[PDB]
Amino acid sequence: SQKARLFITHLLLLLFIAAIMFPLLMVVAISLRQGNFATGSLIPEQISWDHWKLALGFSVEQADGRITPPPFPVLLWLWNSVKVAGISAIGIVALSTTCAYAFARMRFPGKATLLKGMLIFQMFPAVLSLVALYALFDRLGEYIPFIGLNTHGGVIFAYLGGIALHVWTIKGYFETIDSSLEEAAALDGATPWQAFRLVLLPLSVPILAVVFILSFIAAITEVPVASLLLRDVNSYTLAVGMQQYLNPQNYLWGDFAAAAVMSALPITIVFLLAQRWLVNGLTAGGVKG
Amino acid sequence: ASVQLQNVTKAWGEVVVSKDINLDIHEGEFVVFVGPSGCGKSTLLRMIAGLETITSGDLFIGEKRMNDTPPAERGVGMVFQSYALYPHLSVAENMSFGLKLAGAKKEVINQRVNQVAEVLQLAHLLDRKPKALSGGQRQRVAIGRTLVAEPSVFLLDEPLSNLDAALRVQMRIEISRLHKRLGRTMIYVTHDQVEAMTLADKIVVLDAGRVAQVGKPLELYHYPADRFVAGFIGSPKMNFLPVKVTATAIDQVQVELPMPNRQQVWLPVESRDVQVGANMSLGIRPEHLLPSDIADVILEGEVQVVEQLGNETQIHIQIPSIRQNLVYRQNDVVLVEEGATFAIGLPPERCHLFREDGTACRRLHKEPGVA
Amino acid sequence: ASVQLQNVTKAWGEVVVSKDINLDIHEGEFVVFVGPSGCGKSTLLRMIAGLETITSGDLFIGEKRMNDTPPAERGVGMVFQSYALYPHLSVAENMSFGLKLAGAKKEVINQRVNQVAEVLQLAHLLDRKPKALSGGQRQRVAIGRTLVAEPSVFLLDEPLSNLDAALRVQMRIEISRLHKRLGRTMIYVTHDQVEAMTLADKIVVLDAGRVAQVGKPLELYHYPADRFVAGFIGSPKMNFLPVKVTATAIDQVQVELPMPNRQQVWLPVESRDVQVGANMSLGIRPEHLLPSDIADVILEGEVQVVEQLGNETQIHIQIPSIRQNLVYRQNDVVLVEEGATFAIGLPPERCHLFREDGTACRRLHKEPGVA
Amino acid sequence: SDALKWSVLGLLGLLVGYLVVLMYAQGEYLFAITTLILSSAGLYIFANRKAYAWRYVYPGMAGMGLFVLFPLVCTIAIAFTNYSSTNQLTFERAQEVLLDRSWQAGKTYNFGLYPAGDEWQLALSDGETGKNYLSDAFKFGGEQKLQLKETTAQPEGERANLRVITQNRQALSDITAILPDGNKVMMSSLRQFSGTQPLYTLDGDGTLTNNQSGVKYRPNNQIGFYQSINWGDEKLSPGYTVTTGWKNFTRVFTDEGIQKPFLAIFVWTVVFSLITVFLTVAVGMVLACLVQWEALRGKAVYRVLLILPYAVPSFISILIFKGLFNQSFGEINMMLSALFGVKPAWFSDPTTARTMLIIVNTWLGYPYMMILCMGLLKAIPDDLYEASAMDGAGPFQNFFKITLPLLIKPLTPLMIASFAFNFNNFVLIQLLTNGGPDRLGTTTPAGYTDLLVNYTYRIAFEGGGGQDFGLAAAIATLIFLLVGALAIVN
Amino acid sequence: KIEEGKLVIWINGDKGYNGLAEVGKKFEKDTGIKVTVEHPDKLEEKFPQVAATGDGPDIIFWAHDRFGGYAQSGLLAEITPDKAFQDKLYPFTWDAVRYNGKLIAYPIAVEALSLIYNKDLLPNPPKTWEEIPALDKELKAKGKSALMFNLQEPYFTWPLIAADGGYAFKYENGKYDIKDVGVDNAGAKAGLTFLVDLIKNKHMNADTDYSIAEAAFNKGETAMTINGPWAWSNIDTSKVNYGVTVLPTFKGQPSKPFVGVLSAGINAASPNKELAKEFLENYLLTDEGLEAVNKDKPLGAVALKSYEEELAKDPRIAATMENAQKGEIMPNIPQMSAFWYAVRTAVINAASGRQTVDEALKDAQTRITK
Ligand SMILES: CCCCCC/C=C\CCCCCCCCCC(=O)O[C@H](COC(=O)CCCCCCCCCCCCCCC)COP(=O)(O)OC[C@@H](O)CO
Ligand SMILES: CCCCCCCCCCCO[C@@H]1O[C@H](CO)[C@@H](O[C@H]2O[C@H](CO)[C@@H](O)[C@H](O)[C@H]2O)[C@H](O)[C@H]1O
Ligand SMILES: Nc1ncnc2c1ncn2[C@@H]1O[C@H](COP(=O)(O)OP(=O)(O)NP(=O)(O)O)[C@@H](O)[C@H]1O
Ligand SMILES: Nc1ncnc2c1ncn2[C@@H]1O[C@H](COP(=O)(O)OP(=O)(O)NP(=O)(O)O)[C@@H](O)[C@H]1O
Ligand SMILES: [Mg+2]
Ligand SMILES: [Mg+2]
C-alpha cells in the first residue's frame, strides 16, 4: 500500500507543480521574447537575449548598428535588495524572538492586552502611512542622517516595526517546548538570558528560519516604502528600480520580467540555506512523557 | 542547608494536593519521601526548588524564607522524575553545562565529569545525545548532571526507577557515599522499599497531601502509627483481619479471632481508648507468620495463589470468615498447589492492632534495633 | 498471535545492538525480557513493533513475515518506556484513541474505558490532560491506552517502574488476570525480579545484544548457564569467589578455596572437560549461605556493611585473601555491626562453578520445582 | 564590566537630552517630547532590575510604536480634517502662495547691462514706441532707484552676457527703474524689466485685498478658503487644510447613494477572505506535510518549486493571470475548450469572476501558509506518531487526529491576520478584474468583485472631487473598527 | 525649502532625460547654474507631496491633465511668456495648460493615437470606419483580419465614440462646464453602436485587450491597429512593413482621439523662477534643445512649430499631429476620474451584451454628472 500512495503523491505533486509553474514560465518567456510583449507562445517565436544582456550589464548591438549601453545598474539594484532584505531580516528575527521570549515565559502587567493590541494595531489600514513616514524620516535625517531619507538604514529601520505577527508566531513555537528544560537550566544557575540563548533558541531554530524567510521575501518584494525613501538611482533596490520600466501607456515588459525573475534568485537561495535549520526531532530524548 | 516547610499548602484551584505540611529537614540529613503514586511527593520537590507556587504557608532553606525566591537562587539541584535532559547537547555537555555557566576551568570540568561518568557507567556514552540513549541511561545522565553541580540541597525524584537490580545496588551505594563525603542535605523520593530502608536517616510517609508519619526506617516498620502507614511500609503488605476486643489490661489487649472457633489472644499492645466489644483490625506481616508446627495460635485455610520467587515462596491462603486472603512468606522453594490446605502460626508479640479510626494501639513488645 | 525471530540482527551503522537473535514465542505465552540497562530490550520490542528496522534476519507474527510491514498493520500494541502520551487529549481520549480509529462504538468505548480506568485507579482523572498528572499516573494512562485496544500481541516496556510497591502488586495481578482471560501473546520488559519471576511463562536474559539464556523462572535461578546469568538473576546478586581445580571425579568437581586455611570441597557438578589447575569461579547466593554452627565448610571474616530491611538483615563480610565482599542474607532483624567478626556455612550442593570462559558446569543436585 | 554599566547608561543618557534640547531648537516639539519619553522608558528599564522583563519587549515595542502606531494615529488624526488635493496646504503656505501671485501693471522693456569702467549702466528698450533709455553709472548693492534718460545714442560698454546678468541677479532685482514720465519698473525676468506687481497685499488683521480689482478676502476657517467680502460668493485658490469635526465620518452615514451596494460588497469581501484563508491554509499545510515525508525522494526539489509563486513579485504574476484567463483568447480557455468543450466567462459572469479571483489568490497565498507550516510541523514530536501507529493509525487518521489539531492553535492568530489582510486586498481586485462586472443601478458605481476598500477608494480618490484624504482616512478608521470588531469576536 | 542658484528637474523615465541633461550643460556653461535631472518612480504622485511643504524640484515634466490638479492645489507658478514666444507654439497646445484662464506650464510635446496599418496586407488604408466591415471580409478569406485594437480601455475606443458628437466635458473658452457632459448624446450612441456592430458581425472581439491587439499586429495576423508613438519600436523590431496615418472618419467626421501634451511646470515654491523661465524658453524650447532630447528618446510630435515642421518629414509624426489637432484636448479637471471609470464600464457593458448601447451610456452619463 505504501508504494501505491507514494506513486500517486508523485503524480499529483508533478501535476500540481506543472500548473503553478505555468504562470512563472510565461514570465520567463516574456523575458526572452524580442521587443516588449506580455503575451505570446511559451517558447517565444522570436527569441532575444537583450533583456537579460542589459540586466546583466552587457551593451547591446541593435538593428541600425549603434551600441546601446545598459540604461540601469540592475545587478547593483539586486545587491542593494539583498543587503536591505538581509540586514532587515536579521533585525526582525532578533527583535521578535526576544519579544516572544518575554511574552511566552515571563509575567508582566498588560501582557494579554499588549499582544491583543499588537495583533489588532497591525491590522489597521493606514492609507496615509506614507505621508506619516516621509515626515518622520525627513526630521530624523536632520539628527541621525545615517537613517534618514535616501539611505538604506532608513528603509531597514522602517521594516523593523513589522514584527507583531512574527512575535505571535515565535511565541507559539516556544510554548511547544517543554519548560522543564529551561527549569533545569535555571537550577544549574542559568540566568533567563542564558536559558534563552543556550537552551531555548537551539530547539526553536525551525521557526527562526521561518521568520528569516518570510522577512527576507517581504523586504525583497517591497516597493512603496523603499520607493518613498530612496532617491539616488545607485541606491535603489531591485523592486524600486524595476518600476522605471512601467509608464502610463506601456510597460517595458521584457526588462521588467527579467528583473522579476532575478528577484526570485536571492529568495530561492535563502530558502535553500534555511533548510539546515528546518529539522524534526530537536526535543527528542529530553523529557519523559 | 536546612529545609523546613511550615504549614505548606498547595491547591490547583479547588483540588488540594498538600495540606498544612510541616516538615523539618536538618542540615546534612538524608531524608526519603515515600507514598502512593499521586500523593504529592514531586509537588513537594517542585515547591522547594521554586518550580511550582505555594498557595499558603512558608518554605525556609538555610533559614531564609524562599517562597518568592527565583529557582536559580535557592541552592537547589534536582534529578527530575521526567529527567529533563538537554536534547541538543551530548551527555558530557549535559553534565558540564552548569560548570560552564560558572566560569570553570576546562580541565576542572573534564576531571569531575569523567569522575561522575565512570561511577554511573556512562564513560563510553559521553558523545551520545539523549535521543540515542536507553531509558535507564538517560536517567543516569540526569543523576550525573546534579552530582556534578553538587548543590547545597539535593532533590532526587525516583532516580533509580529504570535501572537493573544489579546497577540499582551500585547507585544506591554511590549516593550513600556522596552523602557521607559532602555531608549535605539530600531529599530522595522513591517507591523502592530497600532504597528507603538503607538510605534514609528519616522517612516521611505521605498520603493524599498529608504527612502520615515521620521516623527512622526500623521505627516505621516496627511501630506504624496507623493502619495506612502499616499497610504501606514493607512489601508484600501487612495482612489485616477484623477482631473483637474481649478484655483489656493497661499493657495488653485480648482479642477474639473471627474464625468459627473464636480463639482468644492477648497482645502486648496498649489499651488506651480500646473498649471491650469494639471491632479492631489486627495487623500481622507475611514475614512474621510462623510455621504451624512451632505455633500456639493456628490459622488454617485453602491455598489460592503460590508465587515461586526462588529465594522464597509466597503463599496466599483463604481462611474462613476472612474476606481478604492471608499472605505468607517462607524461605527457599516450597512445593504447594492451589486448593491444598495450609496452616500457619500467628505470633502475638508481632501483631499490630488498629482502632475503628485506623490509629495504632502502640505496640509494647520491644523489637531489637529501635531505641 | 505467535511471534518468532530468526537470526535477527540490528546495527546503527557499524555498532551491533542486537546480535543474531532467535526466539520462538508461542501463541498465548507471557514472555519477559530482562537484562542490564542498555543491553537491547527496547530495541528488540520496537523491532517487533515496527518502530525500528531490522538490519538482517526474519521476524514473523502469526506465521507471517513482518520485516517490511508498517507497524500499524502488525496487530500489536505498546506501553512505551517513556509513555508517549497525546498531550492535546485527555486521559479518557488518550485511552480511547485506538478504539475510535478501529470502530467507534460509543457505548463499548465508554464501558471499556471506565472498566480499565477503574482497575488502574484512574477513574477520577478522566478529564485531566497529561501535564496535570503525576509521573505514575501518566505511566498508567499509557497502560490503559494499550489495554483498552486489546491487540493480538501486547508489548510492555518497563510498565510499572514508577508505581508504589502496593499499587504495583495490584497491577501485576491485573496483567496476569488479563493474560489468562484473553490468552494472547504478551512480551514484557522489566527490571523488577518479582515481576519477571511471577508473570513469565518464559524469561529471556539479554546481554549486550545477545541472548544469554532462555528458560522458565526457576530454571534460570537454580541452573544458570553462565556467570553473567548467574550474577543477573537473583538480587542481591550471587557471590563469586575464585578457586582452583584440585582433583576431578567422574561426576563431581573438587576445588580449593583461596583463603589461608586452603580447605578442599567436592562440588556436585559436571566434570566433562574440566582440567586440574584451571582457575574457576565458584558461585553461592546470599540466600543459600548457612549459619556457621550448622555446616561443614566455614568462611570467617570481618563485617563491612549491615543493611536492616526490617524483614531481614543483609550482611557484607570481608574474608581474608578474598577481595570481593561476601553478601549474606538472614531472616529478621540481626543485631550486628561494622567491624564485628562473622562466619558462615558454604553448602557444597548449592555452589555453582564457572569455567575460565564463564560457562557453568551443569549442576547435578536436583532442586525442587523444575520439572 | 560592573561600573561600566552606569557609565554606558550615563553616556547614552547624555546623547539623549543633547538630541532632545537640540530638537527643542528650531521647533520640533512633538519630536523632542516623543523622543524624550521613549528614551526615558528605555533608560529606566535597563537601569533597575525589577523591570527585567521589559528589556526584552521594549526594543520591539519601540519599533512598533514608530512605524505602526504613529502612522495609525496620523491617519486617524487626519480623518478630522478636510485634507485633500483641494485643501492640501497649511494656512501659512496658502497665504504665502497667494502673496507671490503677480499681475502686469504696465509696460515691458527688454533690458541690457553695460559696464562703465568698474561701474554699470542699465538700458531699457520700448519696443512699442522705438524709444530707448539709459541710466547713469551705478554700483550694485541693495535697494536703489535709477532715473532713466531717453537717448538716441549707444552705451560705451560692451553688452554684458547672461553669465554676468545671472551672477548679479539679486542686486539687479533690487533696482527700481524710473522712466522720464514717472513710471516705476523692476526686473521680472533675466531679459526684462516691467511693471509687475503683487496681486494681493496683506493687511495686518489678515484681510487680503486684490490690487487689480479692489476685492477684499478674509480667511474662512470653516471650509478652508480665502473668501471674498458679510461673506461674498467667491473663493480664492489654493484652499488650505482645516479641522472638520465629524464631517468625513458622517458623510459615510449621511449619503444613501454610497450605501446601496454596501451590504452585498461587505458579504463578498468576507466570503472572499474566508475562502482564501481556508484554501491557503489547507493547500499550504498539506504540501508542508508531504514535503517533509521521509519516503518522498524528491522533496528537496519539490519544496523549492512550490514556493516560487512567492519568490516572484505578485504584480507581474497577477497581470499574467489576467492574460491567461482571457475569455476568448488566453491559454486556460483554449485548454478548456479543446478538452471539456467549455469557455467559462471569467470576467463577464459574477460567480466565475469570483472563482477566478479566489483561484489566483490561492496561488498567491499558499506559499506563505506552507512556509509557516514547514516550521510549525517541527514542533510535533515524532514519537506521537509512534504511539499513533501502535494505536492503529493511518496517514489520513494521523493528519486529522494529531497533525491538524496541533497546528490549528499556533495558526489561529496567523489566520485571523490573513483574514484582515485579505479583507482589504485592494491591489488584487484592481489589477485582475477592476471590481467588475458592473452592478447595474449603483449611483456611485460598484461591481461584483469589488472589495469594500475598492469601492471606498473609488469614492475617495476617483469620483471627481479630487483626492479626499480626510474621507479616505475616516473610512479606513471605520472599516478598522469593523474588522477590529470582527477579529475580536472571532 | 528648495536650493537657490540651481535647477532640479523631474521628468519621467521614458523621456530623453540624458538629452535634457545636455541641454542643462549648455545652460550651465552660459549661466554658471547647474541643472540636475531626475526621473524618480511615481514622480507624478511624489511631486504634490513634496511641493505642498515647499520642497521638490524647480521644474516638473508631465502630461498636462495632471497640472490642473497641481495648480488648484497651489503648487504651480503662473508663467509669463510674451506674445512673441507664444506664437512659436501651436495655439491649441496653450489651451492645454490653462488653469482659471492663466498659463501654468510650457507645452513641450504632443501625443495622440493614430491608425497603424500593414503596408504588405493593406497598401492603401481606409479613410472610413464604414469601409472596415467589407475589408475584414476579403481579409478573412486569406485567414487574416482588418482591425484589432484595445476595446477594454475607453482611451482607445473614444476616438470613434467622440467623432459624431461625443465629448467628455464641454469646453467654453478656458472653462470646462462640469455639468455639460456628452456621453449619452446621439453622437456617442452612433459611435458606440458602430463599435458594437463590428463585434456583433465578428469583425472584432469584445475582450481584445492591449496585449492581444499589439501581438496580432506585430505578427501579421491583422492589417491594422490603433495605437500611439510608444508602440512604434516594438513594430520596428518585428520588421512589419508598417505605416502610420490619419484615423478613419465616421459619418464623414474625423475620429477625435484624446490629446496629451507633455508640459513643463515651474514649482510655486521655487526661489529660481527666473532661471527656470530662461532655461525653458531660451534653451529647451529651441530647435537645438528639443533635438538633444529627441535624439536621446524621441518626443513624437512637438509643440514648437519650427521643430515640428522638421520632424513631420517623418509621415508617422505628421500623422500624430494631424490626429491630435482633430482630437480633444484631455481635460485637466478632477471630474475626469469619474468619466474614465464610468465610460470604461459602459463600453464593457455594451461590447459584452450586458446592456444596450443606450442604457450603458445613459447610466454612464448619470454617474459623472451627479
Ligand atoms: C482542499 C485541499 C486541497 C489540497 C491540495 C493539495 C495539492 C497536492 C496534492 C496532494 C494530494 C494528497 C494526496 C495524499 C496521498 C497520501 C499521502 C501519504 O500517504 O503520505 C503521508 C504524508 O502525510 C500527509 O502529508 C497528510 C496527507 C494529506 C491528508 C489529506 C487532507 C486533505 C484535506 C485538507 C483539509 C485541511 C483542513 C482544514 C484546514 C483549515 C505519510 O504520513 P504518515 O507517515 O502516515 O504519518 C506522518 C509521519 O510524520 C509519521 O512519522
Ligand atoms: C534566463 C537567463 C538567461 C541568461 C541570459 C544570457 C546570458 C548573456 C549572454 C552572454 C554574453 O553574450 C554576448 O557575448 C558577446 C561576445 O561574445 C558580446 O559582444 C560584445 O563584446 C564583443 C567582444 O567580447 C564585441 O566584439 C562585440 O562587438 C560586442 O557586442 C555581447 O555583448 C554579449 O551579450
Ligand atoms: N540512535 C542510536 N545510536 C547508537 N546507539 C543507540 C541509539 N539508540 C540506542 N542506542 C544504544 O543501544 C543500546 C540498547 O538500547 P535499548 O534497547 O533502549 O536498551 P534497554 O535494554 O531498553 N535499556 P533500559 O531501557 O535502560 O533498561 C544502548 O546501549 C543504547 O545506548
Ligand atoms: N497541574 C496540575 N493540576 C491539577 N492537579 C495536578 C497538577 N499536577 C499534578 N496534579 C495532581 O497532584 C497530585 C500530586 O502530583 P505529584 O506530586 O506528581 O504526585 P507524586 O506523589 O509525585 N506521584 P508519582 O510520581 O506517580 O509517584 C496528583 O494527584 C496529580 O494528579
Ligand atoms: Mg512523582
Ligand atoms: Mg529500555
Question: The CATH number of the domain where D237 resides is what?
Answer: 3.10.650.10
**Hey, which residues does C360 pair with through a beta bridge?**
C354
C and B adjacent (3 or more CB pairs under 8 angstroms) = yes
* Residue closest to B172 by CA, chosen among E121, D420, C236: C236
User: Do the strands C30-34 and C185-189 form a parallel or antiparallel pair, or are they unpaired?
Assistant: parallel
Domain CATH number, residue A168: 1.10.3720.10
User: Could you please report the per-residue DSSP string of D388-406?
Assistant: HHHTT--HHHHIIIIIHHH
Task: Sort out which chain A residues have CB atoms less than 8 A from B80's CB and list them.
Answer: 180, 184
Same-domain check for residues B64 and B182: yes
Same-domain check for residues C320 and C253: no
Residue C370 placed within a domain: no
Number of domains in chain B: 3
User: Based on the number of CB atoms within 10 Å of its own CB, is E370 exposed (0-12), middle (13-18) or buried (19 or more)?
Assistant: exposed
Of all residues in chain B, the one with the smallest CA distance to C43 is B134
* Residue closest to C234 by CA, chosen among C247, C250, C218: C218
Q: Using the beta-carbon criterion (under 8 Å), do A281 and B86 form an inter-chain contact?
A: no
> Dihedrals φ, ψ of D184, to 5°?
-80, 140
Same-domain check for residues D271 and D412: yes
Task: Sort out which chain A residues have CB atoms less than 8 A from C162's CB and list them.
Answer: none
Q: For E237, which of A35, A39, A240 is closest by C-beta distance? A: A35
Q: Domain E5-111+260-331 classified CATH 3.30.565.10?
A: no
* E357 Cβ contact partners less than 8 Å away, ≥ 6 residues apart: E189, E192, E193, E196, E350
Q: Which domain holds residue A253?
A: 1-276
Cα–Cα dist D399/D411, whole Å: 15
Cα–Cα dist B280/B256, whole Å: 10
- Of A49, A62, A75, A261, the one to substitute when testing ligand 2's pocket (max ligand atoms within 8 A of C-beta) is A49
Cα–Cα dist B206/B213, whole Å: 7
Q: Using the beta-carbon criterion (under 8 Å), do C77 and D391 form an inter-chain contact?
A: yes
The residue type at A177: I
**Hey, which residues does B187 pair with through a beta bridge?**
B31, B155
Task: Sort out which chain B residues have CB atoms less than 8 A from A284's CB and list them.
Answer: 87, 130-131
The residue type at B96: S
User: Do the strands C312-318 and D149-151 form a parallel or antiparallel pair, or are they unpaired?
Assistant: unpaired
* CATH number of the E112-259+332-370 domain: 3.40.190.10
Q: For B166, which of C36, C287, C335 is closest by C-beta distance? A: C36
Is the distance from CB of D174 to CB of D143 less than 8 angstroms? Answer: yes
Same-domain check for residues D3 and D52: yes
Domain with CATH 3.40.190.10 in chain E: 5-111+260-331, 112-259+332-370
Cα–Cα dist D80/D92, whole Å: 19
Of the three residues C237, C260, C277, the one that is the final residue of a domain is C237
> Longest C-alpha distance within chain A, in Å?
80
Q: Is D177 on the interface with A (CB under 8 A)?
A: no
Domain CATH number, residue C248: 2.40.50.100
Same-domain check for residues B151 and B187: yes
Same-domain check for residues D150 and D24: no
E290 grid coordinates: 528639443
Alpha-carbon distance values, D456 to A183, B226, B267, D459, D468 (Å): 53, 81, 97, 5, 11
Cα–Cα dist C201/C205, whole Å: 13
Residue A101 placed within a domain: yes
Q: C127 CB under 6 A from ligand 4?
A: no
Same-domain check for residues B160 and B301: no
> Dihedrals φ, ψ of E22, to 5°?
-75, -40
* Nearest ligand, CA A262: 2
Q: Which domain holds residue D349?
A: 255-490
Number of domains in chain A: 1
Atom of ligand 4 nearest to the CA of C125: 31
Residue ranges in chain A assigned as alpha helix (H): 2-32, 50-56, 74-105, 111-121, 129-143, 152-159, 164-174, 180-187, 192-195, 201-203, 205-220, 224-229, 238-241, 253-274
D151 grid coordinates: 537717448
Residue B35 placed within a domain: yes
Is the distance from CB of B85 to CB of B130 less than 8 angstroms? Answer: yes
Kindly report the nearest CA distance between residue D321 and chain E, in angstroms. Answer: 13
Q: Is B36 on the interface with C (CB under 8 A)?
A: yes
Is the distance from CB of A63 to CB of A278 less than 8 angstroms? Answer: no
User: Based on the number of CB atoms within 10 Å of its own CB, is E173 exposed (0-12), middle (13-18) or buried (19 or more)?
Assistant: exposed
DSSP structural state of residue A47: B
A289 CB neighbour count, 10 Å cutoff: 23
Under DSSP, is residue E281 helix (H, G, I), strand (E, B) or coil?
Answer: helix
Task: Sort out which chain A residues have CB atoms less than 8 A from C135's CB and list them.
Answer: 288
Residue ranges in chain E assigned as alpha helix (H): 17-31, 43-51, 65-73, 83-87, 91-95, 132-140, 154-162, 186-200, 210-218, 232-238, 273-278, 287-296, 305-311, 315-326, 336-351, 357-369
User: Could you please report the per-residue DSSP string of A211-273?
Assistant: HHHHHHHHHHT--HHHHHH--SGGG--HHHHGGGGB-SS-B-HHHHHHHHHHHHHHHHHHHHH
Cα–Cα dist E250/E321, whole Å: 19
Q: Using the beta-carbon criterion (under 8 Å), do D392 and C86 form an inter-chain contact?
A: no
User: Do the strands B56-61 and B3-12 form a parallel or antiparallel pair, or are they unpaired?
Assistant: antiparallel
User: Based on the number of CB atoms within 10 Å of its own CB, is E174 exposed (0-12), middle (13-18) or buried (19 or more)?
Assistant: exposed
Residue C67 placed within a domain: yes
The residue type at E52: A
Residue C152 placed within a domain: yes
Q: Is A110 on the interface with C (CB under 8 A)?
A: no
Long-range contacts of E195-200 (CB under 8 A, 24+ apart): E195/E151, E195/E157, E195/E160, E195/E161, E195/E347, E195/E350, E195/E351, E196/E350, E196/E351, E196/E357, E197/E133, E198/E132, E198/E133, E198/E147, E199/E151, E199/E351
**Hey, which residues does C202 pair with through a beta bridge?**
C31
Of the three residues D24, D51, D84, the one that is the final residue of a domain is D84
Q: Which domain holds residue B271?
A: 238-287+347-362
A194 grid coordinates: 542564558
Residue B368 placed within a domain: no
Domain CATH number, residue B329: 2.40.50.140
Residue A169 placed within a domain: yes
Which H/E stretch holds residue B318? strand B312-318
Omega cis (within 30) before D437: yes
Residue B292 placed within a domain: no
* D80 Cβ contact partners less than 8 Å away, ≥ 6 residues apart: D243, D244, D245, D246, D248, D470
C64 CB neighbour count, 10 Å cutoff: 12
Is the distance from CB of C318 to CB of C301 less than 8 angstroms? Answer: yes
Is the distance from CB of B107 to CB of B79 less than 8 angstroms? Answer: no
- Of C9, C33, C34, C43, the one to substitute when testing ligand 3's pocket (max ligand atoms within 8 A of C-beta) is C43
Alpha-carbon distance values, E63 to B150, D236, E106 (Å): 82, 25, 11
Same-domain check for residues D308 and D441: yes
User: Do the strands B185-189 and B30-34 form a parallel or antiparallel pair, or are they unpaired?
Assistant: parallel
DSSP structural state of residue C295: -
Find how far residue D15's CA is from the centre of its chain: 33
D174 CB neighbour count, 10 Å cutoff: 14
Same-domain check for residues C14 and C66: yes
Experimental method: X-ray
Same-domain check for residues D298 and D409: yes
Of all residues in chain C, the one with the smallest CA distance to B194 is C309
Same-domain check for residues B49 and B134: yes
Task: Sort out which chain E residues have CB atoms less than 8 A from D167's CB and list them.
Answer: 32
Q: Is B172 on the interface with C (CB under 8 A)?
A: no
E170 grid coordinates: 464641454
